[PDB]
Design a protein around this nucleic acid. Sequence first.
DNA 1: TGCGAAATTCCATGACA
DNA 2: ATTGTCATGGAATTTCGCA
DNA 3: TGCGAAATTCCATGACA
DNA 4: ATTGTCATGGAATTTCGCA
Lengths: 368, 368, 180, 180
Amino acid sequence: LDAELDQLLQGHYIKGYPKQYTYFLEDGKVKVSRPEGVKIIPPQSDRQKIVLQAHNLAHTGREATLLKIANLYWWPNMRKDVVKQLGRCQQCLITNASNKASGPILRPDRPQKPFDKFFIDYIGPLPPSQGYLYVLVVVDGMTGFTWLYPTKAPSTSATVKSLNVLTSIAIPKVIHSDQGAAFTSSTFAEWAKERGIHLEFSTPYHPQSQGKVERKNSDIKRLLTKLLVGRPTKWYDLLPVVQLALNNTYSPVLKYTPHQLLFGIDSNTPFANQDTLDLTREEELSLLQEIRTSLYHPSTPPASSRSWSPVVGQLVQERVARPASLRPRWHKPSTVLKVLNPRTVVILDHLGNNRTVSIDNLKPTSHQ
Amino acid sequence: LDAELDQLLQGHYIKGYPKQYTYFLEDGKVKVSRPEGVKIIPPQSDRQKIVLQAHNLAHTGREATLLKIANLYWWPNMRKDVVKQLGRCQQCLITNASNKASGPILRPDRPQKPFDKFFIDYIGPLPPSQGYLYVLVVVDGMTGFTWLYPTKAPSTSATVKSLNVLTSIAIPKVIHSDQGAAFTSSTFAEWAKERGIHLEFSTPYHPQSQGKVERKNSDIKRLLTKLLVGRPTKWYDLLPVVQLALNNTYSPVLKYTPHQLLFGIDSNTPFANQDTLDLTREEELSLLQEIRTSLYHPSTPPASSRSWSPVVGQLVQERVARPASLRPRWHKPSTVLKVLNPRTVVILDHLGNNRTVSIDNLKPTSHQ
Amino acid sequence: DRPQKPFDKFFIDYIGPLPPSQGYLYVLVVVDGMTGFTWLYPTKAPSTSATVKSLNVLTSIAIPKVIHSDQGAAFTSSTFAEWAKERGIHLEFSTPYHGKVERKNSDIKRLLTKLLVGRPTKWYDLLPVVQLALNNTYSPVLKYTPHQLLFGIDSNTPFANQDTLDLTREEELSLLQEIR
Amino acid sequence: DRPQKPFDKFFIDYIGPLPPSQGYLYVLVVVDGMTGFTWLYPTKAPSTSATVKSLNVLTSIAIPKVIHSDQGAAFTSSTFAEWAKERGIHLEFSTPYHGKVERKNSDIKRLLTKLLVGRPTKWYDLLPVVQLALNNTYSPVLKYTPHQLLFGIDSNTPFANQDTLDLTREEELSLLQEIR
DNA sequence: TGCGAAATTCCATGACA
DNA sequence: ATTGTCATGGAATTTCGCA
DNA sequence: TGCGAAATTCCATGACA
DNA sequence: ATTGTCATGGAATTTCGCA
Ligand SMILES: [Mn+2]
Ligand SMILES: [Mn+2]
Ligand SMILES: [Mn+2]
Ligand SMILES: [Mn+2]
Ligand SMILES: [N+]
Ligand SMILES: [N+]
Ligand SMILES: [Zn+2]
Ligand SMILES: [Zn+2]
């Protein structure tokens, strides 16, 4: 109000308003001679409404908002008031993009043993082949050894059917998957409990988390493609061929096929490696245990120059999953309960539920 | 054949086969004692079929192919034969991904004058509003000044209707668009010829090329979103508001609104800039010509460490546009006729048609 | 006193009734005072709402400080009053029955007649070219065309032939044939 | 002579007819010679094609150098001959009417009976557990279970109770009740 | 001829397709 | 026959207000 | 204790979602 | 309650074959 502006008009000094300038009255308002021109100094009691009207024109960020205000007004520390507003505009907070990258990816340790962890996932739909439209892909964590089962749907029941056949060979400690209907259903849960299998789940909408299997899907599709060139897309009869082909293919970085990681000896397939011909099986298994421990493990990459890591109690926003046309891409702000690791957090989604969430599906709410 | 292998068995030296090793016969085949073990040296007349069978198992690249062959065989310069095969496998060439990035983007000069160039494009479909489903976005190249027209379809006829209304203000030299049905039709062509407007087209499937307008679409949608928060998505009545809002918004880097670039003076809208109050219109227009020439222009960024630039006569492959499920993502190899610029080429698509194409839709065929 | 700028004042007025053209009967004429730039809008009536509908399009591009009009029914209604107040546009009325602007209004009436003759129905489609003409026509007073004054540049459509504008003998008689 | 490895030899044979279980009547038994690892496949017949269908699944995981069988009809057909030649699998026949492997074949017949009793129809569903059992059962000869010999590791399902395998009095009489 | 804070500029990030 | 663009908001850098 | 070429390893790029 | 991955094919680096 007129409070602070009065003493200013007389010429006695107030903190914030530089004394070297000349402040006067004209047309009813307090003005000031600034190098860029003459600007109205509104009363503090007016400043909020102003910042608001300016920002609201096109819902602009800091500078683009400031530049409108600086057209008519000047007051001390303008951006501070501008930013106060931005941090309060529900509409900008939930609609704007982030301009801060996720922190650098973790590279989890390779499972130590075959059957310690399975990654599973569905591929499809695909062109119908013999009435089948999907492929269930199971990928052993440690070996990369992969099983494929053609299905009619990505259903719990088709999953159970296939895994009963698979587990006839061995039972895994853990099975990891995404939060797909087929895997989160309680029917599947009970099938797992019934066998002492622990179900592990990827944070929501974060397929990197099943990276092992997503990545294997790529090869599966790539080789199916090559094989079906200029033929009609009858992929049903090729699953068995692709399974075999891939399980017996060298990873250039490991110098081992998944089959060799699984069994320590090639079977009767072409170009079978013969180097352990003379060792007894036991000598073979002993050399296989050593091969398994000394495999290459990638290291976490350098952070990008403008990343953020999550801090307990930080205000953050989860990404809207399937956002409707012309609706916000972000949820309202929520609070970081617990940092499970630099790339995974538990947030209270201010409903409020506990959610475990990847930082790739998060932005740090702007302006504190 | 037995030719070269014979002299080898006796112990007299042949080029390529290191003399320090011992070559012998056993089980009917020529063998050799290599540090990793004993390997069959097949006759040159056999080597191709071998590389082929190995590569064909899972259609593997260089190393992963080599490692299969090295299980049974050794011969001089194995990878050379491996690579010869890879460069001939139609199926790998058209299905594999590239592992070489496009060269660094060009930053074209800003049009010199308003109406020198329009970028145009359609947004939609959107939730129906008053029976309208699209928005025609016209963006003047130099100013960023943008016009919006609600349409029922992204049709030639709706385009012509809208641009007749727009061109009532001025006629542009050039109109640039993508190769959308609505703009490539001859009805549109004739509408352009009828007015001395030159039609310019983005290379196929390369929206960066209409970057100006694509980018403006983002703001249009972003502001429509903010404005429709918690309301039903009635966007028809908001187009006029968004047009105005955006045309009068500062670009922080230029420190000018598109409106000011267009007219050199703000109109009666909030926070109108008053700095040229005292100049005559002519003094204003003179200062506007100077503002227009000295605008910020980005510079081409640094090449990424593994990029390729196109060379006349190079074998390259165009990306398949809408590739069916389990079909190749690349077309057969074709030849670079002419390098229009480091990011644009004319290729003979071995049908053969002339096509002008962005390097972003190209990979350099592998293995020469 | 501060020199005259574009957007300082828009002068509006209706022309018609005309012959029906694609369902339309009138023209709302908007002339910027400083520049002499002309905008035309076809309407079905000279009503407050046909005015508001049309000015809404124009005021999406540029908003004038002041609108000037005669005391036409359309412009003196309280609806139209409300409409302007909403936009901080000030209304200004020439007194009942009483420069650069008035010449433009005359030009429009005349240039229309020059082309409606022979085809009194095709005027809707001609409104775009009519405008480009009007706006790329040299002012003898100022050295410049309204396009140049508006945008600070030459236009890609100069009307190098400042034209007859005048009704020839074939027309005078076929315009006196249409009237009968 | 080179020591014996897994995949060196698969021993196959049919068991049945059994009581109908979900449409199936037989079991194709595949036992790896070196490891003693067992794979079981339900079939509707002991035919070349039920064999080929089943081995196709198994030979998607691992291909044996040699298959060994009796001179069963299924295995001596030229179809089955063709099938193996295609895969570089060599066929090997025990002479008509004539170690580690034979014990396994006995175990399977016995362990099945131990559970089919009371529920002669539910065997299809039990084939998975039957296998895990067979393959996580300690060999007294070798220190190891076939799982360990196959994969070079302990399994997450050890069958710590090497079990009765023997028919009790309640069963002996209800298996003699089923037969009547 | 130098200090603390404010104003400005820089620029990586992401989204338009 | 052609070619990426730019709002954004923390950080880095420059300028201001004062001696 | 050093040269030319071959073999191997490195690693950015892109695609699975 | 959880976490990216790896085939690929030019380039960079190491090793080999020979003195
Ligand atoms: Mn009138
Ligand atoms: Mn038998
Ligand atoms: Mn677009
Ligand atoms: Mn997936
Ligand atoms: N880990
Ligand atoms: N350019
Ligand atoms: Zn806002
Ligand atoms: Zn291939």
